[model samples]
Target chain A: SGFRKMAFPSGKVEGCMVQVTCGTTTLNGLWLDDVVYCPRHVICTSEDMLNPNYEDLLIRKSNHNFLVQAGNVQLRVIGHSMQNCVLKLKVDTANPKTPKYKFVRIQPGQTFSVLACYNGSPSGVYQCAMRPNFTIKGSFLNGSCGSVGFNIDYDCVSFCYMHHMELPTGVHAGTDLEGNFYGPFVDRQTAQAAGTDTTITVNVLAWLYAAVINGDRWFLNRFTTTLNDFNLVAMKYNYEPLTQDHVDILGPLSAQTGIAVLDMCASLKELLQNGMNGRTILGSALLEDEFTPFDVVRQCSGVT
Target chain B: SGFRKMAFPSGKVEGCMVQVTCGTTTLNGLWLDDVVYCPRHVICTSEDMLNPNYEDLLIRKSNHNFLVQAGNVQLRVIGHSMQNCVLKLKVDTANPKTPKYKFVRIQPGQTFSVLACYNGSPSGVYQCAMRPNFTIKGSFLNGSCGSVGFNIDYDCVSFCYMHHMELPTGVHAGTDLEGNFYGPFVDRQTAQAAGTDTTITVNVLAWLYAAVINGDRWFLNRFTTTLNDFNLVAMKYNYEPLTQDHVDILGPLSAQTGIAVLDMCASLKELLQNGMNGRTILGSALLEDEFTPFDVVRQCSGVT
Candidate 1:
């Protein structure tokens, strides 16, 4: 009995009951089984289970942990409208022999926390997946909504290892893939110290583009940037780089909110090669706080 | 004899020295008695003895004062290729009757000066209209040439008025136009008082503008302003205000430069009225340059 607490998509549930079903084949396993139970009923393990799929589930020992295979599990919310849709999930454990289902309720303005296990280990690393909730009525009239999904691994961890170590700062490189590290980034403060300081200087601006989509959708959420960060601009002082407290105040947006700073330095390299005017007009020093959000207006990032 | 300068509208030819038809029409009091020198000589006088319709400018006078009236006169250069051709009107005050005209040869890149007299007094206030010549030519390309005109009276009067006003240490008014005063200007030292106990406020700004625009274009043209002169935003010491300098800078481009600060301010007012958001996005403080242009990207005047 290695399992601590078990859940499919991960989170608290409304109904203390679980449902299970097997498609065509029968499964034989004594150590693990999917089951739904109330507070009074204690879980138990069995050696063999009969046919199970969408309609059936095994009432076995709750100690056994489960992992859903790709495309096998899905979560749904019985929401009123786009604003605050209550999500409910029916997780099909990797083994259809014990298809499990659970029910939960999500409130508005609050985040629904889902406890999820990444790997199959009974004591595997658990992460809380949460999505913000808001009144559907307010959302519809004001035009707003939100969503979230499960991902396999930490995106930035792999991101830093794959590219950050390979290339030096300011030199970006990557293959054709989503969330790819296009190149290394060198802020103006460092570039100026070395002779090779060349990059489109962008004022590090924090803009809130509210949205949520997994893998496929880019960004989808409506957010108003309510904070004014004083130290957004990348600058230098005592050997180490420094930023203002204003920026420190605004917390991280949803990890799904994968906004990016523009790669202006690369674009500038190409522009300078054209003529003296190009070289003169676009200089490293010239690229200061003035050029933030240039991507929004001039798309300065596209050149790279 | 109240006679003034005359113009020859049509082409004229010279013949014998005696009978000269000086193409001109003079006042009833003035006359041209004789033409003794030659047709080229075209004698002028205050009274016309021969042609009653014309006055002779070559009259007698004890005082060396010259009487001239050529306010709205134009010397159109007919050289098509030399579109911006220059000409010298050599007035021969010594001869009083004979004058010479020379085509002033001007080349590209050379700075040329021209004077237009609203009043024909030498000391009558003059503006130096100057512009460096530039040329760009290519195969079968049409040439576009332009010259800057100087407002001699306006410039001189502006210089004089500025000198007379004795600029105050802090905010002060300068020119008056259309019954409105137009300044509350402060020097750099005075601007330092901003956001401080001793600083002036927006009320003073309004007071200055009302005082300067005292219903006169001449006064308006003479107006000069700096940051300290106008309290752009009165309520907030840190905030900026609507200023004459801003007005002047944007006023000329009302037709072309789409977004005027005033117009943006109006929209901000709307936001305040609606209470859709907490506060207005663009406050008067932003117009001032406490933060660099890069700071704008994050806050962006005010938007998500």
Candidate 2:
């Protein structure tokens, strides 16, 4: 695959027409609803390949003949388009003639559950992916289209989520004015703006319906519990990170609104801890921040 | 105080008019060169007042009497406008007869250094801040405001920089279509398009300077160091954070060109950590993420 010179007499397959719209703008010069036909760009390389100093060619040799022997293994599928994509999660031990495998079908706009497939066996690494015919094409798959290979000694402490997103050529690369910038792009800004506004509307209706049925407090409690969790997690790793007692003291500040900000210092500590282990890992402690709460007696317009 | 009904016969004090701009866009709805007449909206509140369940009316009684008292201290000033804002940093001890005082003037667009005030003192607890007339206003200080107050105990682990920033009402608040949104709005989409295109031109010039100057690597090294620090901190606290050795192994992947993403997971961790201490404290650890380096061999075509 080193820039091969091969031409097809019939030319390439017809590219799919996909309209790319983020926020209020369309990149294909089309209307928000318009579609632009474009071919998918795909490039796949391992960490060893990317790192010049890394000389391990046989690192994944175990994976070629890997196992899931009695371990908690999961198959995650991310769906991008309208088409329902079928994926095969497979495992092979010594005998190539026989292998244990399962098929999972994922729908558009959703994902298969974090399916814990193999259980009760030996402990080792495993190799898995979408079965034959489902070639990994574009980076747009978001982990939905291909194989997910991992090593499993099952220490749990060192396990990791290999977050991957491959952008098409000119998508997130540099110097292209029209290309996407910010890996976690600002499209999130608009999505969040829209989602937050809609949430308020949803809460209003939830409260009104509860009032009509004389269960306003109960309805509100459910929402409050959710927000409290959010607030609790935020405060856990704050600058003056809360101890268990502090967390208890500040039980639920803004149960009405899920408004909060991240605590940078606590997060950095978590990052340092995780990075020391070599993979991007989750933090053990919760983070923190301040609360601007609505007065409790301020009769909520959300109710009546 | 409690929504007082006092009318301004002159329609409020000749409100301080300040031009607001960030990155590129001027936020006051005026042309870049034009000035908008706007008033400063200030709100002053204390944590003592907000926590209704609290019983101490003398929470700031320590502040009614505080001093540097042979401790590390600093007076930081952030100038918003060209006006010379005279500020006073005062220290009061047992005597009404005499109190230690220092007056500092601040200029616009710049800030005084984080001054290390009194030193050579026994470690315990001490309080400090700017004196009266320089009252603590809205939480708009960002640590470089009227005064900085602190309790000094001898634990470097708890040493902190209290960061803060409070936006005026209707700023960065909600989903009102008419409301002012992102500080620069999202017009950055177009600005980025224009800016990235221009960067190519700048890079062409940069390469020429490096080539003729006989030191391209050094020129590149300086820029790489800055970006590496950024990329490292981001990865440190990412959701699937890497360990130190992993980070070291993955270091400088984009040395030729400073290109990377702000690992949101890592960033959110920072936010949570900082918030835990109840402020936007800086992150201590570097975070992690992927990067695509600039193909140094791709010569200056200015275009293909």
Candidate 3:
């Protein structure tokens, strides 16, 4: 199933026509819906803490991670045309001179992947925002019989690199991306991004998450925040992991991201792998951090 | 879409409303007189230390009522992702035969409450059976059902004492009932009988899974107990945990009753709840033990 089928509710809202559009002005070509046709290119979405690990976009294959550090911005996206005509993915760059995932012949057998840094402010401190309408630009040819397809997956997020999450609540894996919050959960696309039932969303988020955080962590989502009075943050980005009480809620803080980022959204197998350790932390209403336990990283997401 | 119109004999087990055959046994493996729906579930037994977590994603038993008194209750399930789910859980009797589940469901909530304890050994060895037609139950939903399908996202889990029959170990959830272990939820009456089996012996090697997580499974020091061997609730207590330092092995109850065991994982929420000293066993958990409970339970088995 491609992005059209998953994102839109109508069959009429499906497929592309011949001579696929790719204009200097069109954001995401085909239709202005990069959120639907492109991978990693993010759009506005709402996440709930009650079922945090769950959402409509979980099935996607890209790391639809959108970021904004202070005023700087960035968006992650990758693309490919379902047709044999090899293609190119162009990010509606802040400017042609600004570095972006500019040239990578994308095609049927290949996936054009990149951690596109959109138009960042002069102070490249926090980037990962977006450039809608022309977010991911691409030229294409419609597939003969099959509807010219577009596939994308993403984990949109927002953070202020002030060494801590901008909110005062525990950094919850499943919660609203607005409010004292964090955008996009990281574990959603832990696959290798090769369109092979794996992850890249986790990969990029792992890196970006690391780059934006400091030890002062608070892994709370809505369900927990409601349990007690707001904490220590007389209020701030660094809050407490809302553990009303327990035996092991706090470990190395790093361990928290593996679960806190995506609210246990990894594949069952992945959840089983990471869930074991997470079980211990959660069992005690505890939390922590250290090394993000998201094993198996890829070069595309800037993993060492 | 009630339980009556779901499908049957398919690799997909979602919780969506994708019409059923209510024609015979109905879509969700039930008669139309049903109300709610849920994804299939696996309870009790261990998940081995070697392979990934997909091992025992779904056990075959249709009736997982280990404790006849307290732990003897049904489950609650609903609809969302795991679509109009259909279940054909196979439960093994002392006769070593598997039986299909003939059950019912309702609305305001899909509660499958039943008085439990079918066939299992009094010897208290761990028995691991599973649904007949499903080698990949949880995986179906966990795999995110190919956009075109739906599945049951919620489920109930607990320990099943007694009953043991191995099916070699090749594409199966490796099982070995050769160690001195205990059974599921019990009462003052059943507790007295558990220790009488004196047949207790220790080949730890057979039942003692290696804590090979990072070499010799270090439980704080060098205690080698794999997290897989322990019940979901027990697993939490056994691990080093975030709140404590040093290994705390407080289990298998020395001559404890069925009621005591159930609290450990029979939805053991408050086990980690209120700190203790009450007729209800306070925090020791009179119901399901601590960590064995999770958010998914409510939709599967009514949570406290």
Please report the candidate that would top TM-score against the real structure: 3
In terms of docking quality, model 3 is incorrect
Worst lDDT 10-window in candidate 1 chain A: A137-146
Off by over 4 Å in 1: A1-304, B1-233, B236-238, B248-257, B270-276, B279-304
Tens digits of lDDT, candidate 3, B51-86:
222223333222333111101222222221221121
lDDT of each: 0.19, 0.19, 0.19
Better model by TM-score, 1 or 3?
Answer: 3
Which ten-residue region of model 3 chain A has the weakest summed lDDT? Answer: A1-10
Once superposed on the true structure, which residue ranges of model 3 sit more than 4 Å away at CA?
A1-237, A240-282, A285-304, B1-11, B15-304
Each prediction's RMSD to truth: 33.6, 28.1, 23.9
Worst 10 residues of 2 chain A by lDDT: A1-10
Query: TM-score of model 3 relative to the true fold?
Result: 0.19
